[PDB]
Design a protein around this nucleic acid. Sequence first.
DNA 1: TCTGTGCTCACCAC
DNA 2: GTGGTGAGC
Length: 509
Amino acid sequence: MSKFTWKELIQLGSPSKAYESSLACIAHIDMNAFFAQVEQMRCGLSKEDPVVCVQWNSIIAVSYAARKYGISRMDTIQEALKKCSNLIPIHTAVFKKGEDFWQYHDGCGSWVQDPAKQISVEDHKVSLEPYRRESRKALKIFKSACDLVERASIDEVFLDLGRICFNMLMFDNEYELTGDLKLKDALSNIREAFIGGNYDINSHLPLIPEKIKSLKFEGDVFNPEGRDLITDWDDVILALGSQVCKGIRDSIKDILGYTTSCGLSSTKNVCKLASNYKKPDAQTIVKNDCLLDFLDCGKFEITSFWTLGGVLGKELIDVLDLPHENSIKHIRETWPDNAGQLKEFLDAKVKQSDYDRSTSNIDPLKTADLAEKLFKLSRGRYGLPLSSRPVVKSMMSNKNLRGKSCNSIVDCISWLEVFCAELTSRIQDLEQEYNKIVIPRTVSISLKTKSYEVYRKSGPVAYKGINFQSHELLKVGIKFVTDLDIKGKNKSYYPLTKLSMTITNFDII
DNA sequence: TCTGTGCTCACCAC
DNA sequence: GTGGTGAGC
Ligand SMILES: Nc1ncnc2c1ncn2[C@H]1C[C@H](O)[C@@H](COP(=O)(O)OP(=O)(O)OP(=O)(O)O)O1
Ligand SMILES: [Ca+2]
Ligand SMILES: [Ca+2]
Ligand SMILES: [Ca+2]
Ligand SMILES: [Ca+2]
């Protein structure tokens, strides 16, 4: 008999509950050196070209070819050039003050000797739109290939591979395990059993068939301990996932040119670590059996977990007297029976004045949740559902001003054109994300004076029509900046040190 | 193979 | 209400 029940297997077929099954097959896919690849691709360059994406004098993304020279985000452009003279730095696109479009100034930048070809920080604003556009393309590819996709960030997704896995397992007559061997023949038992319907759902699954063990994982399977690859149905699901996953990743590579790193496990949190384990263009598979091996390999700490890499993670180091090293094993070793034992410990720790509820990130009421979470996380069995992102509350386009650039109403107005164009662009990236029409009803203009005093005017934006139009947003912005200018006469004001436009009260009609 | 004249977003103590 | 801040790119 198998460790797993029919109920846990069948649940993969359900988007709502697939993640809760210990048989969950989840993937985390992260674009390698994302802005550098998008610039590489746009400029017709190879994967092995040492390109660097730059903002002013900083490096914001470093291609894996560039990293062979010890270049990193830490280096300034000039520094990175001393490591590799053949470096290809590419500035992000920029808005020019007073223009409503961004553009690329190729062969320009602070590293370029010629004074003619610079991108002055004083007169320009970075646009990340090209990276947003590319991310959106990636997203349409992922969404086409998988019925539940979470957009974790601009270059990251989670995929719930449940349906695909389950359906491939049960109904896929195409697939070849080997020459003269197919899935339908290798899995005839469980497939006949499933259609048969004669199982009780809490009945355990039949033992995997010897013939299934020839099923190949795609990518790098992390078992330091040389465990057997396929011992149970979870390993069958994960292996099927890995194949499905490579194909999706090859899609991204073939349509858009981007390499990715990918983590495959039964859990999001573990997927996130695993995608990051090998870069670039690698798939890391972590089987449930190798979970402990993986978490204990020495690269990870309590602090590695998502939402525990912040101050809350620190408090947990202090509040559980955690070792600086091997803290994952530690937490599992200290409370090996159940969430309860650690919950109680937290409660006991809380009361003695080792801390005050003024600077604390730990909620006493919901202390169980924390204990379940850590207990689960430490064994790599804490499964969160994939979710969509919260609707957008506000969008701001800002410029921190240096110099005397903003010395007048017309200067402001020139910066406003840029903010307004950028915001208009971003409304659209959202209209396409939501496939619904999105209009902001309120605008706010803010500025900091020469002496850093804040001025702000906030109000409704009138549309002479049903459709949002950029020029209407600008018009209200102009009025507000004009009113604020009047407000500041004979007071510290110009030259300004900051100016921004924030939209809010989005109607998602 | 963390960082600064980065950039943005959301939260909640004052 | 929001500036300072925390967090994430
Ligand atoms: N500290 C930062 N400053 C500016 N831009 C950043 C920073 N961190 C990330 N970004 C931008 C540029 C990155 O290409 C993109 C995605 O971030 P991230 O995935 O962490 O790194 P990456 O894709 O550049 O490298 P990796 O291959 O390690 O994922 O977001
Ligand atoms: Ca990345
Ligand atoms: Ca990332
Ligand atoms: Ca097992
Ligand atoms: Ca302590």
